[PDB]
Amino acid sequence: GSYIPGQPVTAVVQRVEIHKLRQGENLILGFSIGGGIDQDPSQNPFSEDKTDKGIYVTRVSEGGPAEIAGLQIGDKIMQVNGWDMTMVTHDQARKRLTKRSEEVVRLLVTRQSLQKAVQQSMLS
Numbered sequence: 001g002s003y004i005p006g007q008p009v010t011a012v013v014q015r016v017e018i019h020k021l022r023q024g025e026n027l028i029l030g031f032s033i034g035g036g037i038d039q040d041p042s043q044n045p046f047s048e049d050k051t052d053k054g055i056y057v058t059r060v061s062e063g064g065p066a067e068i069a070g071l072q073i074g075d076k077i078m079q080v081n082g083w084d085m086t087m088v089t090h091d092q093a094r095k096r097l098t099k100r101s102e103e104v105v106r107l108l109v110t111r112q113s114l115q116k117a118v119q120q121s122m123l124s
Helices: 065-069 091-095
Strands: 013-018 022-025 026-028 056-059 076-080 104-112
Touching: 013 065, 076 091
Parallel strands: none
Antiparallel strands: 013 104, 022 026, 076 104
16 A cells, blocks of 8 residues: 555654744744754754654744644654755754745654653653
């Protein structure tokens, strides 16, 4: 069977759709990231989960398109605006997801906001 999404079993990949958010005098997608492969999972807030790294949200919009649509903090973005956000540096990701040129983007995050997964890190 030709499965089109990228959901395995435990993690669910879900789509997000951020519409243009004007913050002050900039245009932002609302959310912020922590970084992907350019970061060290041995000391990362949301990459302590997967050593496979990837760009994840560290903050979303305080009340904007990110949280409005369905983008949550911690959720790793694997797909942004048909560009694939999987395996990209913080720098390159920033210059795509928080760039001010684009208004609305079709994103896909893999919910890592799970349980049983995401090793305790002595916090759990």
